Structure 1
């Protein structure tokens, strides 16, 4: 995740573009994940719950 300031634009679009690039990369999510240790039981449980919610989200569209 990196940007540049090119062709004399204010330092208010470059900063926001950098923020968007960092959000797209997924930096804060990765750091928050490695903040503490998640045991495999908890990881598998989270994946199962997210899958259930994703399927319900898809089905409710129709």
Structure 2
């Protein structure tokens, strides 16, 4: 949204992505598909994968320190 409670005059700096409760980017998951009932086991249970990506970054600082990457 641009947001309707910010204060009511048109001030055009407001970035709609940096102003969204939820809209678009998950909210219309429910259109032009039914996410087949346990399709989510392979769509959404890649939570482990994105938690691994955070682990990998948190590792990678340390290996660069002991190896002297620069």
TM tier, smaller:
0.5 to 0.7
Deviation at 1:34, TM superposition (A): 0.9
Length-normalised TM-score, structure 2: 0.54
Relative contact order: is structure 1 or structure 2 higher (C-alpha 8 Å, sep ≥ 6)? 1
- The runs of 5 or more residues in structure 1 that have no matched partner are none
Q: How many residues align?
A: 52
- In 1, the alpha carbon distance for the partners of 2:23 and 2:39 equals 22
Which residue number in structure 2 is paired with residue 12 of structure 1? 12
Deviation at 1:12, TM superposition (A): 1.6
Counterpart CA distance in 2 for 1:12 and 1:47 is 36
Please state which structure has a larger fraction of its residues in strand. Answer: 1
Provide structure 2 residue ranges, at least 5 long, that are not aligned to the other structure: 60-70
